[PDB]
């Protein structure tokens, strides 16, 4: 058991091993330290959970993100590097620290960018999400501020499993019951954002939100329609100005013909026809950097915790047996 040691930063305490040195604050339920680690020399990144025993809610998203930063092993995607807890007892037990490789910006940090350099980006998201995606996780809310960018431009997805501009529009009126493509309308979003320099869909509500979209892609069609339940999700739509489909060659004009192309099939309104995320790079637009046999896919993923009610002690024990069983990658 390594020896801890306390300190304060911003009104917050962060007691960790005395492996992790030079605190720096730089995160989803909690707060973000950036830290050095004397054992493997890596700069990492240190999540402390906020209350996470507060309510049954915070207890089950503690116990959630754990399981799920436990089992993601790819280069796209936040792993663990390191848990661990300052108690010696479950008793005590109280707190949780997450460890993982510090990247050290945003995608928006890092925007107007070139072609290649958005190939190789927007790449390396769908590598991931297909990663993801295999494990029957979703991420439900990507965007330009959970892409963690390193200086090489490496990228891993972060914040995937937890959950206004790079949200699907089925999301966003709760239509059909939603496929893993949700996420696919936010690359889309993000693409088409590296490529022009601007949000596509900045809306200011719902409501115009959804009014931006159906301008670049048409309001649904009667074959849509037809797989929309909600007499208000329907009366809503139908009675809008109806409105056709945009030629993105003409919207996405001076960009890469084949990103255009791409563009066209993420950024579909029904979601059964939107491409998925090992569709995505198969596609032409990638060629430089696609390779089928190193676009790995995920060891079965066990979520059915998510349909349990359990006591906040349950949940806390269940967490803490999850700390202790952690084994650390090679
Ligand atoms: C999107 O990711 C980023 N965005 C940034 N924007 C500014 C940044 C500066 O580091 C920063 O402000 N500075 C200050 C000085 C220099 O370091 C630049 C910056 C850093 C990152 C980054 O690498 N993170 C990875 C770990 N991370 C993050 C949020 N939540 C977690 C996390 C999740 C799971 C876990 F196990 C542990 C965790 F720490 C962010």
Same mark, same amino acid.
């Given at each position: 058991?390594?020896?801890f040691?306390?300190?304060?930063?911003?009104?917050?305490?962060?007691?960790?091993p005395?492996?992790?040195?030079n605190?720096?604050?730089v995160?989803?339920?909690?707060?973000?330290?950036?830290?050095?680690?004397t054992?493997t020399?890596?700069?990492?990144?240190?999540?402390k959970l906020?209350?996470? @025993?507060?309510?049954?809610? #915070?207890?089950?998203?503690?116990?959630?993100? *754990? /399981? !799920?930063?436990?089992?993601?092993?790819?280069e796209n995607?936040?792993?663990?590097?390191?848990?661990?807890?300052?108690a010696?007892?479950?008793?005590?037990?109280?707190?949780?620290?997450?460890v993982?490789?510090?990247?050290g910006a945003?995608?928006?940090?890092?925007?107007?960018?070139?072609?290649?350099?958005?190939?190789?980006?927007?790449?390396?998201?769908?590598?991931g999400?297909?990663?993801?995606?295999?494990?029957?996780?979703?991420?439900?809310?990507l965007?330009p501020?959970?892409?963690?960018?390193?200086?090489?431009?490496?990228?891993?997805?972060?914040?995937?499993?937890?959950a206004r501009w790079?949200?699907?529009?089925?999301?966003?009126?709760?239509?059909?019951?939603?496929?893993?493509?949700?996420?696919?309308?936010?690359?889309?979003?993000?693409?088409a954002?590296?490529?022009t320099?601007?949000?596509? @869909?900045?809306?200011?509500? #719902?409501?115009?939100?959804?009014?931006?979209? *159906? /301008? !670049?892609?048409?309001?649904?069609?009667?074959?849509?329609?037809?797989?929309?339940?909600?007499?208000?999700?329907?009366?809503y739509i139908?009675s809008?100005?109806?409105?056709?489909?945009?030629?993105?060659?003409?919207?996405?004009?001076?960009?890469?013909?084949?990103?255009?192309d791409?563009?066209?099939?993420?950024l579909?309104?029904?979601?059964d026809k939107?491409?998925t995320?090992?569709?995505?790079?198969?596609?032409?637009?990638?060629?430089?950097?696609?390779?089928?046999?190193d676009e790995?896919?995920?060891?079965?993923?066990?979520?059915s915790?998510?349909?349990?009610?359990?006591?906040?002690?349950?949940?806390?024990?269940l967490?803490?047996?999850?700390?202790?069983?952690?084994?650390?990658?090679?």
């Amino acid at each position: 058991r390594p020896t801890f040691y306390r300190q304060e930063l911003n009104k917050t305490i962060w007691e960790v091993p005395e492996r992790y040195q030079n605190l720096s604050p730089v995160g989803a339920y909690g707060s973000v330290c950036a830290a050095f680690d004397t054992k493997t020399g890596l700069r990492v990144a240190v999540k402390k959970l906020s209350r996470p @025993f507060q309510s049954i809610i #915070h207890a089950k998203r503690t116990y959630r993100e *754990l /399981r !799920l930063l436990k089992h993601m092993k790819h280069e796209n995607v936040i792993g663990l590097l390191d848990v661990f807890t300052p108690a010696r007892s479950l008793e005590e037990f109280n707190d949780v620290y997450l460890v993982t490789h510090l990247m050290g910006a945003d995608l928006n940090n890092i925007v107007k960018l070139t072609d290649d350099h958005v190939q190789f980006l927007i790449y390396q998201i769908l590598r991931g999400l297909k990663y993801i995606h295999s494990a029957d996780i979703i991420h439900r809310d990507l965007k330009p501020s959970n892409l963690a960018v390193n200086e090489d431009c490496e990228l891993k997805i972060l914040d995937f499993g937890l959950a206004r501009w790079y949200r699907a529009p089925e999301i966003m009126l709760n239509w059909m019951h939603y496929n893993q493509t949700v996420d696919i309308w936010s690359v889309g979003c993000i693409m088409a954002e590296l490529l022009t320099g601007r949000t596509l @869909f900045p809306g200011t509500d #719902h409501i115009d939100q959804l009014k931006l979209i *159906l /301008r !670049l892609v048409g309001t649904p069609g009667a074959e849509l329609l037809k797989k929309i339940s909600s007499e208000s999700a329907r009366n809503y739509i139908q009675s809008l100005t109806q409105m056709p489909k945009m030629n993105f060659a003409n919207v996405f004009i001076g960009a890469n013909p084949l990103a255009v192309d791409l563009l066209e099939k993420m950024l579909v309104l029904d979601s059964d026809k939107r491409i998925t995320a090992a569709q995505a790079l198969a596609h032409a637009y990638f060629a430089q950097y696609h390779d089928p046999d190193d676009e790995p896919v995920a060891d079965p993923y066990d979520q059915s915790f998510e349909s349990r009610d359990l006591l906040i002690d349950e949940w806390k024990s269940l967490t803490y047996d999850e700390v202790i069983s952690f084994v650390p990658p090679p």
